Design an enzyme around this catalytic site. Structure first.
Site, PDB file in Angstrom:
ATOM      1  N   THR H   1       0.858  -1.214   0.000  1.00  0.00           N
ATOM      2  CA  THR H   1       0.000   0.000   0.000  1.00  0.00           C
ATOM      3  C   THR H   1       0.885   1.252   0.000  1.00  0.00           C
ATOM      4  O   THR H   1       1.863   1.279   0.762  1.00  0.00           O
ATOM      5  CB  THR H   1      -0.937   0.021   1.217  1.00  0.00           C
ATOM      6  OG1 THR H   1      -1.895  -1.034   1.111  1.00  0.00           O
ATOM      7  CG2 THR H   1      -1.656   1.343   1.375  1.00  0.00           C
ATOM      8  N   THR H   2       0.572   2.236  -0.831  1.00  0.00           N
ATOM      9  CA  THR H   2       1.324   3.480  -0.848  1.00  0.00           C
ATOM     10  C   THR H   2       0.355   4.649  -0.889  1.00  0.00           C
ATOM     11  O   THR H   2      -0.458   4.747  -1.794  1.00  0.00           O
ATOM     12  CB  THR H   2       2.291   3.598  -2.041  1.00  0.00           C
ATOM     13  OG1 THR H   2       3.139   2.449  -2.103  1.00  0.00           O
ATOM     14  CG2 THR H   2       3.152   4.834  -1.889  1.00  0.00           C
TER      15      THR H   2
END
Ligand code: A1L0C
EC number: 3.4.25.1
Lengths: 242, 225, 231, 219, 238, 226, 204, 199, 236
Positions: H1-2
């Protein structure tokens, strides 16, 4: 809060419990309930109040409730109050069976319910249950038994007894007609009809105005059944000829 | 109808005032504290001749150095008596020492006004606490309002007004225990409806070095003469 | 939860509810106890002698343990509650002290419970009075009496219930050492006392005697009839 | 277990296999895994079987109460909120993995709901131990706005992949077609497998079994 | 008896217990609040019932928050309790949302707490009335008043206590909207001296507090020297 | 809350609060229930105070389950409480037994709740009487549950305003071989005997119970019967 | 495992208008046998039986609590419980102990009280039902039972043939299990009668 | 996840990847990690999907009620405080970092990092497993005074660089621009993402 | 008119089967001396209420009887002010909770029913009195269109075409009765006219409050002094 409290569980000046006595007044006007103990069984005869022509019939009975495999009871007084106590009786009996793996002795069941009734008259601030009960049952300690308990929490064993409307007059008749240790279910059924005919004030006794249940022992097992209209009708016929 | 914690127009709690009225219907108890110790005498007030005098307990032991005389509703006194016994034993367990008379009286008093709507009403009893500690012989008196005070001589119960008068006219700071024991019995006899024998009264003393001692029948007779 | 104060002080220093509870005791069936040499006598008016009644189901005299019996007067339903509370106490005492309770010990517990109901929120006092008898571990006879207020006393002979005064007044002049000399002589004092208030004295009186290391030995119709016959 | 769903032009199609296993042994050859939540909302369950059963029953019950009070048709979003709020509360201990599909006023909706309480709204999903195989069929052949028959064939092929590729799946394919108009529950839509015919057989006569005692009780 | 409990409506639809609590406020001394352009000024006629009391005893001006002042009238013990309730509400808001509670929201919370004591027989209505004044760059000057029934409103000028009607007439003559806190302090002092009775309630002490641009949004007691001018000016006026 | 009872026994043995609750039921809008051979009909008069009221905004006939319907006479807001409690009781039963609760079982549970309000602390009894209908095991049921908690099984009955005349009318018109359609006709006629002026399809509510389930009759359907 | 501490095996089989339920009679603690007449099948109505396998203590507790619940149900409802309703009642009872379960896997067998249709099902320890049309097994030798049932069971069997089938299934299955056996009891439930038979089995 | 959020003069730009992962399997390749808490307030989710979803819903509920009581749009700081409170109170149980970004009339565009119960206001914030690979990139590329277009470009580039390197990130890039005028959504698909050194 | 015991003090049944305390609560709504009128249009709902502020030192903007429950639900309170505020606060909470647990906005009729159910509890429990206020709710429902609901102290609630509450409630009911037996401008004008006719007052822009919801713009909106003036001039 103190201004509205009716104070249901306090002693009156002459050491009386008004709520308990007032609840007894209500039981005295309710339908007649009579119990007779015989050598080969016990019976319950109760007058029906619900007699309207548009009424429907779909239950086991009206005033007779099975409590467990070997016990039944009849009630007099507030109908909805009786439903609460009858459900409580069933739970007490099942709880005893869960614990000892044996059916609860008749007298032990009555005593447990009387303890709940006594509690209402001593603390809590609630009005007492306006019910009087008649119990019929069989157990391995005393065989066939008959009990009667009231709103105060008092109870007693009887050979024959009556509660409800004209119970004082029904008890008088029983005293002069009940033969200690010489009664049979057939002979007890006749006495019930006789007594019921007198206490009730509607000329023709009628099979639709009454409900009769018997408790007997058949092949090592208790049998409780409510007499059908035919059997009850026949019993009334017998009295006419009697 | 009012609640139990209602104040009257003159600034008094009705229930506490009614509880004090109950103390007046109780048996007379006398307490005298001298330099040699404290003595407690209480009229047994036996109602009938078929009643066993030994079963009546108006004077009890709280601890070895502390005695207690009660007056009023005797059944209510038992609750306080047990509380006092527990307090002193708890004190012994925690501090490895004896509790003073004042401390015990203070602890018992703290349970007087604890009622409302748990006690539903105040206690209908008056107590006399007599014992010996580091300050010597000590006599304390506690009533239903929770008020406790040290006293030289005190009478509680039905004939407390009469007993007090005699007490204050015959009490001095130098009087010995023997005089106190005799004086207290003299006054008890004067305010007692029945005749004062050795079976209808209770007497106990507590001196420095001696434990709480309840006089026996023989010891009362000797002193009664 | 109902927490209203039911028992409070009255202006004269009395507890109204407690006095009303005592009124209920006065309407109860007469009970008479008498101390004996090595047996205690308890006599209760049977009153309700109906011919359709199962006598065994309504006994006033009960057992608290194997060594202590008791009689009561007043509200019968209140009595049943107190009797069962005492039974639990006796069982508890045998599992924490490894010894049976003395007569005074159970009387104290019962009296303490009665006192608790005169100073507790939401409840009325018990409407009964009890006569407790039996023998202690050694073998001495005891007769105690508790009332609704929670006060208890030891007695030589005592009566409770309806017309208790009359039976008490008559008991002073008839209680002696010769009268309680033999076991059969302890049954004589009781009956006479009961006869001063019990209508048609005979089959209207229940009886019970507590002996040494012997169980609740209730007397029977004919057993009691013997004494009634002679008298 | 292989369960799968897709959103098509007019509604939702749900699919499942019918095998229930105890460890490595087949216990039930015909377990119904597509459950009724409401008239237009169904649910496929994977994961712990007793948790799925209880969770969906509790939800259906609460959703029926809701619709009796409001007097309207239940929304798929409500079912997803009730389910996910319950699962989050138990912190994953209630092992219910579900595919929720339905049609309400706002159109067809498909959701996947996982044991810890997370959820995702998607046009096609798969769950269970055969989920990767079913998902490979969807990724390879799904198109948006398919017709009812094309979606039924695609969902059947996806469940069938799980049935033949995953040892935890087997038996028949069941399907549930939900549209604005109707619900079609097709329990046993395809039967790709069957016990073999059996050559010989076994036979037990009259008293082949030796008996020690006997009681007859007539009713 | 229809006026013994707060949970009993009288036949003409009134809760007499709440109205009896309002009588207690009408027996108290006057307190006024004036909202101007720069802030809010509070003025209380604190009656000195004895010479034995120290100056500043039984103050009727409280600080319920950094930017909020409270002027009360009625039962002082009831009012002190309400001030504690308000302080806790402001502190709670700062903890949950991270910033100074808006006055209107604070007035709403306290009023509902006050309203909760007017529905049951178990409790009795509060016997006091109070004003809430505050100032912030964003919201500007705010002044609210809450009475025993729980109703709260925003005001330009307000008065509570025995001479609330006479004080109100005096307040209406001023044009506080375009006025500043500095010149309003003298006016508030003047009004309190005019409504003060001499025949009855002899000897009183003037309490002054303010919050606005001049105090950088901090509610505080008006500086002694500034109160000296006001007291001087008010004495000469009447 | 108050922990003492508000309903107590009077010197003559009555519970006046329950009797006063019955007076509230007797002054309510008329309700009729008729058990036919293959179904049950619940009809109630729903006359609004004015034409400003939206007829299709509130109902008096309510479903508890798919096979159980309810109707009342007395206090509307008290009725809402019981309806909500009945629905809850029915769902609890379903969660445990996985089968629709039998009508008699539901009535017993609802009556038990009503009995509780005649003995519990600080509360008054419900001022409503209920008419419950249902279909269990190929059979129709009709029950009546009053303020005290007592319940009776009926073939046909009426409650509310002029219920005594309605019952007499029903006795001289009801027969055991009656059919649902015929039962619906005599149910509307019973309401007509005590009705004020002009019975339309907007001032009366009708509910029916058969093998298909319980459903409230639509206004269009009611118009046809009228 | 806790489920093999006492051993035991139960199986139910559906026939033509009849049902059969059987179980082993051994009560033992681990390797040691204590008794050979332990009850595992309890009557829950005229034509409704429940078989419990697993931890002996829980077998008795579950049977007793279920009897408690069923009795109250019969008094209140005034009728005999339906086979399917009992299954739900049992599942509810087992699910209540989701985290701290009763170690037993019940097997229900019976005929509906009005139509006499055969019904069988099996639940796990958590309370998940498995209603089948052929047979259900439970116990330490379930794998052996499945084998015997899968190859021997036939549809529409009459009472005599059904008895032989379930008897052979149980006998050969428990003989390959060390902690199961010491006798087998079989109940054949018909519309008009209940037949109970004890089989001649190995006692080793 | 970013996830990433940048402040600009007059508003904020917030963006994230669309990958939901369970070990090595991609359970959802097009998930929307940008969730609105109010009209002009958004939050980016990272960490546990269940925890973040539950927290976001709890906060949205609390802020909605708060807004109707105060009769005005909630401040960005208030939204961050509400999130911080929940995140700190349940730090032992929750494994999710809810990054807050939005616009209000008092402070304009604000970005708040509230990981673990600690609240910090920053000109730009990055989170999730993939953020570790772009720290160097954002420190060298970020310049004060960037416009919304530049902010959108800056955010897209950083996310694209992280998606290529981080196994837990991938799919599409969700982008939202918040200002006084409103919220503008945008989706950069796989074939339209910025391309850098790949081989 | 029979009475017995404490039936006029607490919410217990009287001999006739009435609840006097609930009846006294209806009289408490008229203590404020205001009247409110709500009218439902073909695609809109309008609420108008009397705005009396004769104190002069009061901040006019803070004196209102119109409240926003949610973005799409407005309401007008009539009766005891403090009672009204708490009821409005409760309604806001009920709506927020519904959205949170069910995932969608609470329908106007569901909210009114929820408020009515809470009011019912006060008529059955003796320790607390009923609130002396009345709540009228308006809003747009997706399928049914514009809704107008009202619940009172007894716990009774209903949907209306047009309704009113307060001192001149009876005459407003009669006035609207004939009219009912409409465009946005017609619905608004009908509401203002009813209020004006029953109160015999030629209203000024700052003497009334107007709240509206339409199918085009569902958000609950309060008309400004300038917006109300436009309607007032068109009626004159
Ligand atoms: B990211 O990788 O941090 C992402 C952000 C979330 C969506 C806020 N988290 C996840 O990838 C993720 C996956 N899961 C579960 C894994 C087990 C199956 C259900 C989903 N939780 N967070």
């Amino acid at each position: 809060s103190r201004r509205y409290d009716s104070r249901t569980t306090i002693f009156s000046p002459e050491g009386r419990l008004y709520q308990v006595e007032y609840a007894m007044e209500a039981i005295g006007h309710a339908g007649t309930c009579l119990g007779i103990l015989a050598n080969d069984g016990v019976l319950l005869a109760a007058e029906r109040r619900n007699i309207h022509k548009l009424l429907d019939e779909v239950f086991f009975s009206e005033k007779i409730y099975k409590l467990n495999e070997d016990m039944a009871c009849s009630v007099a007084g507030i109908t909805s109050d009786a439903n609460v106590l009858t459900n409580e009786l069933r739970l007490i009996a099942q709880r005893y069976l869960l614990q000892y793996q044996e059916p609860i002795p008749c007298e032990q069941l009555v005593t447990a319910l009387c303890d709940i009734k006594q509690a209402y008259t001593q603390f809590g601030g609630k009005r007492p249950f306006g019910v009087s009960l008649l119990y019929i049952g069989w157990d391995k300690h005393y065989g066939f038994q008959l009990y009667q308990s009231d709103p105060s929490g008092n109870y007693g064993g009887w050979k024959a007894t009556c509660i409800g409307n004209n119970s004082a007059a029904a008890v008088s008749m029983l005293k002069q007609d009940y033969k200690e240790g010489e009664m049979t279910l057939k002979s007890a059924l006749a006495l019930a009809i006789k007594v019921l005919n007198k206490t009730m004030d509607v000329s023709k006794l009628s099979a639709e105005k009454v409900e009769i249940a018997t408790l007997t022992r058949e092949n090592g097992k208790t049998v409780i059944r409510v007499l059908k209209q035919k059997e009850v009708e026949q019993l009334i016929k017998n009295h006419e000829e009697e | 109808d009012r609640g139990v914690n209602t104040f009257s127009p003159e600034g008094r709690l009705f229930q506490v005032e009614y509880a004090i009225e109950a103390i007046k219907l109780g048996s007379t108890a006398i307490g005298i504290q001298t330099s040699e110790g404290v003595c407690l005498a209480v009229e047994k007030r036996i109602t009938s001749p078929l009643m066993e005098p030994s079963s009546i307990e108006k004077i009890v032991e709280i601890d070895a150095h502390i005695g207690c005389a009660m007056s009023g509703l005797i059944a209510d006194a038992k609750t306080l008596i047990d509380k006092a016994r527990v307090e002193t034993q708890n004190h012994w367990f925690t501090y490895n020492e004896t509790m003073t008379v004042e401390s015990v009286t203070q602890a018992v008093s703290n349970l007087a006004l604890q009622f409302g709507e748990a006690m539903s009403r105040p206690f209908g009893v008056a107590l006399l606490f007599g014992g010996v500690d580091e300050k010597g012989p000590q006599l304390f008196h506690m009533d239903p309002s929770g008020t406790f005070v040290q006293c030289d001589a005190r009478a509680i119960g039905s004939a407390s007004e009469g007993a007090q008068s005699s007490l204050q006219e015959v009490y001095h700071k130098s009087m010995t225990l023997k005089e106190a024991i005799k004086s207290s019995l003299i006054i008890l006899k004067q305010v007692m409806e029945e005749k004062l024998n050795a079976t209808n009264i209770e007497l106990a003393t507590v001196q420095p070095g001696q434990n709480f001692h309840m006089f026996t029948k023989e010891e009362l007779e000797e002193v009664i003469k | 939860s109902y927490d209203r104060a039911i028992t409070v002080f009255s202006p004269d220093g009395h507890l109204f509810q407690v006095e009303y509870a005592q009124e209920a005791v006065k309407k109860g069936s007469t009970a008479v106890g008498v101390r004996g040499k090595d047996i205690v006598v308890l006599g209760v008016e049977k009153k309700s002698v109906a011919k359709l009644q199962d006598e065994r189901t309504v006994r006033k005299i009960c057992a608290l343990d194997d060594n202590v019996c008791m009689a009561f007067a007043g509200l019968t339903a209140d009595a049943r509650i107190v009797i069962n509370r005492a039974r639990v106490e006796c069982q508890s005492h045998r599992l924490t002290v490894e010894d049976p309770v003395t007569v005074e010990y159970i009387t104290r517990y019962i009296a303490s419970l009665k006192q608790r109901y005169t100073q507790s929120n939401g409840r009325r006092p018990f409407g009964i009075s009890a006569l407790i008898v039996g023998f202690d571990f050694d073998g001495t006879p005891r007769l105690y009496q508790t009332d609704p207020s929670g006060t208890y006393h030891a007695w030589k002979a005592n009566a409770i219930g309806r017309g208790a005064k009359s039976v008490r007044e008559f008991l002073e002049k008839n209680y002696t050492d010769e009268a309680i000399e033999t076991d059969d002589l302890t049954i004589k004092l009781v009956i006479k006392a009961l006869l001063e208030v019990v209508q048609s004295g005979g089959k209207n009186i229940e009886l019970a005697v507590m002996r040494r290391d012997q169980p609740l030995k209730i007397l029977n119709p004919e057993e009691i009839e013997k004494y009634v016959a002679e008298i | 277990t292989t369960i799968a769903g897709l959103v098509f032009r007019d509604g939702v199609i749900l699919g499942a296999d019918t095998r229930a296993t105890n460890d490595s042994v087949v216990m039930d050859k015909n377990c119904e895994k597509i459950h009724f939540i409401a008239p237009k909302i169904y649910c496929c369950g994977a994961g712990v079987a007793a948790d799925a059963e209880m969770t969906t029953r509790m939800a259906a019950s609460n959703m029926e109460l809701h619709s009796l009070s409001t007097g309207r048709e239940p929304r798929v979003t409500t079912v997803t909120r009730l389910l996910r709020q319950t699962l989050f509360r138990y912190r994953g201990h209630v092992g219910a993995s579900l595919l929720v599909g339905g049609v309400d006023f706002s159109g067809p909706q498909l959701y996947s709901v996982h044991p810890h309480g997370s959820y995702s709204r998607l046009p096609f999903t798969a769950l269970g131990s055969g989920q990767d195989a079913a998902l490979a069929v969807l990724e390879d052949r799904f198109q948006p706005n398919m017709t009812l028959e094309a979606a039924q064939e695609l969902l059947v092929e996806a469940i069938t992949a799980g049935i033949l590729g995953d040892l935890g799946s087997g038996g028949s394919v069941d399907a549930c077609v939900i549209t604005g108009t109707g619900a079609k529950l097709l329990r046993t839509l395809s039967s790709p497998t069957k016990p073999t015919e059996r050559p010989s057989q076994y036979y037990f006569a009259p008293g082949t079994t030796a008996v020690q005692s006997q009681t007859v009780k007539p009713l | 008896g229809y006026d013994l409990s707060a949970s009993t409506f009288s036949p003409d639809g009134r809760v007499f217990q709440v109205e009896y609590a309002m009588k207690a406020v009408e027996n108290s001394s006057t307190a006024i609040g004036i909202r101007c352009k720069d802030g809010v000024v509070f003025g209380v006629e604190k009656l000195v019932l004895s010479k034995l009391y120290e100056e500043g005893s039984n103050k009727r001006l409280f600080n319920v928050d950094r930017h909020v002042g409270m002027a009360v009238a009625g039962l002082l013990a009831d009012a002190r309790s309400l001030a504690d309730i308000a302080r806790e509400e402001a502190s709670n808001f700062r903890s949950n949302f991270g910033y100074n509670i808006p006055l209107k929201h604070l007035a709403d919370r306290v009023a509902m707490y006050v309203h909760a004591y007017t529905l049951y027989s178990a409790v009795r209505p509060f016997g006091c009335s109070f004003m809430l004044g505050s100032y912030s760059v964003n919201d500007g000057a705010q002044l609210y008043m809450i009475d025993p029934s729980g109703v709260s409103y925003g005001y330009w000028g307000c008065a509570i206590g025995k001479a609330r009607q006479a004080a109100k007439t005096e307040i209406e003559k001023l044009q506080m909207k375009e006025m500043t806190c500095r010149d309003i302090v003298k006016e508030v002092a003047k009004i309190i001296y005019i409504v003060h009775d001499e025949v009855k309630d002899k000897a009183f002490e003037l309490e002054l507090s303010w919050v606005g641009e001049i105090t950088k949004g901090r509610h505080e007691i008006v500086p002694k020297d500034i109160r000296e001018e006001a007291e001087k000016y008010a004495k000469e006026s009447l | 809350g108050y922990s003492f009872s508000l309903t107590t026994f009077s010197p003559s043995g009555k519970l006046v609060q329950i009797e006063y609750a019955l007076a509230a039921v007797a002054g309510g809008a008329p309700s009729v229930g008729i058990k036919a051979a293959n179904g049950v009909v619940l009809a109630t008069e729903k006359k609004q105070k004015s034409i400003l009221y939206d007829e299709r905004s509130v109902h008096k006939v309510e479903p508890i389950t798919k096979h159980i319907g309810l109707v009342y006479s007395g206090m509307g807001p008290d009725y809402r409480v019981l309806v909500h409690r009945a629905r809850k009781l029915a769902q609890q039963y379903y969660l445990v037994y996985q089968e629709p609760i039998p009508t008699a079982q539901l009535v017993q549970r609802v009556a038990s709740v009503m009995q509780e309000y005649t003995q519990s602390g600080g509360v008054r009894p419900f001022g409503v009487s209920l008419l419950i209908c249902g279909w269990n095991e190929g059979r129709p049921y009709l029950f009546q549950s009053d303020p005290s908690g007592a319940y009776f099984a009926w073939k046909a009955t009426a409650m509310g305003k002029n219920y005594v005349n309605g019952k007499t009318f029903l006795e001289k018109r009801y027969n055991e071989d009656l059919e649902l359609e015929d039962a619906i006709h005599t149910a509307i006629l019973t309401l007509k005997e005590s009705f004020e002026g002009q019975m339309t399809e907007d001032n009366i509510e009708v509910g029916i119970c058969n093998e298909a389930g319980f459903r409230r009759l639509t206004p269009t359907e009611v118009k046809d019967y009228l | 495992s806790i489920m093999s501490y006492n051993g035991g095996a139960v199986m139910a089989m559906k026939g033509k208008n009849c049902v059969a339920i059987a179980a082993d009679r051994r009560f033992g603690i681990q390797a040691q046998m204590v008794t050979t007449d332990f009850q595992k099948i309890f009557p829950m109505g005229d034509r409704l039986y429940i078989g419990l396998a697993g931890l002996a203590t829980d077998v008795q507790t579950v049977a007793q609590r279920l009897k408690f619940r069923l009795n109250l149900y019969e008094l209140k409802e005034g009728r005999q419980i339906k086979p399917y309703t009992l299954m739900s009642m049992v599942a509810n009872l087992l699910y209540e102990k989701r985290f701290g379960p009763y170690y037993t896997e019940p097997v229900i067998a019976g005929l509906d009280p009005k139509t006499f249709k055969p019904f069988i099902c099996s639940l796990d320890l958590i309370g998940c039902p498995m209603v089948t049309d052929d047979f259900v097994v439970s116990g330490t030798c379930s794998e052996q039972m499945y084998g015997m049932c899968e190859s021997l069971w036939e549809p529409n069997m009459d009472p005599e043939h059904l008895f032989e089938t379930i008897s052979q299934a149980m006998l050969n299955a428990v003989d390959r299990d060390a902690v199961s056996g010491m006798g087998v009891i079989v109940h054949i439930i018909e519309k008009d009668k209940i037949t109970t038979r004890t089989l001649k089995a190995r006692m080793d | 996840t970013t996830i990433m959020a940048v402040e600009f003069d007059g508003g904020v730009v917030v963006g994230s990847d669309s990958r939901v992962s369970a070990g090595e399997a991609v359970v959802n390749r097009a998930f929307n990690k940008l969730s609105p808490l109010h009209q002009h307030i958004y939050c980016a989710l990272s960490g546990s999907a269940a925890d973040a979803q539950a927290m976001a819903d709890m906060a949205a509920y609390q802020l909605e009620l708060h807004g109707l009581e105060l009769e005005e749009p909630p401040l960005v700081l208030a939204a961050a405080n509400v999130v911080r409170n929940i995140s700190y109170k349940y730090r032992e149980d929750l494994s999710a970092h809810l990054m807050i970004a939005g616009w209000d009339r008092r402070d304009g565009g604000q970005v708040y990092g509230t990981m673990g119960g600690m609240l910090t206001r920053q000109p730009f914030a990055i989170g999730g497993s993939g953020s570790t690979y772009i720290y160097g990139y954002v420190d060298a590329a970020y310049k004060p005074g960037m416009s919304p277009e530049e902010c959108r470009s800056f955010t897209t580039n950083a996310i694209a660089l992280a998606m290529n390197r981080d196994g837990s990130s991938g799919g599409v890039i969700h982008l939202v621009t918040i200002t006084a005028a409103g919220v503008d959504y945008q989706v950069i698909l796989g074939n339209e993402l910025p391309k850098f050194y790949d081989e | 008119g029979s009475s017995a015991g404490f039936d006029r003090h607490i919410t217990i049944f009287s001999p006739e089967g009435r609840l006097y305390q609930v009846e006294y609560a209806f009289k408490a709504i008229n203590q404020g001396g205001l009247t409110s009128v709500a009218v439902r249009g073909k695609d809109c709902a309008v609420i108008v209420t009397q705005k009396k502020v004769p104190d002069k030192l009061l901040d006019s903007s803070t004196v209102t009887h119109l409240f926003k429950i949610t973005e799409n639900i407005g309401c007008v309170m009539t009766g005891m002010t403090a009672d009204s505020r708490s009821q409005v606060q409760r309604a806001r909470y009920e709506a927020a909770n519904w959205k949170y647990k069910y995932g969608y906005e609470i329908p106007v009729d569901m909210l009114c029913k929820r408020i009515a159910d809470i009011s019912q509890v006060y008529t059955q429990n003796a320790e607390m009195r009923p609130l002396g206020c009345c709540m009228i709710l308006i809003g747009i429902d997706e399928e049914q269109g514009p809704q107008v609901y009202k619940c009172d102290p007894a716990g009774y609630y209903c949907g209306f075409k047009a309704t009113a509450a307060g001192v001149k409630q009876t005459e407003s009911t009669s006035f609207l009765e004939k009219k009912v037996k409409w465009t946005f401008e017609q619905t608004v004008e009908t509401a203002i006219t009813c209020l004006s006719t029953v109160l015999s007052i030629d209203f000024k822009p700052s003497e009334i409050e107007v709240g509206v919801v339409t199918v085009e713009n569902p958000k609950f909106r309060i008309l400004s002094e300038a917006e109300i003036d436009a309607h007032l001039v068109a009626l004159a």
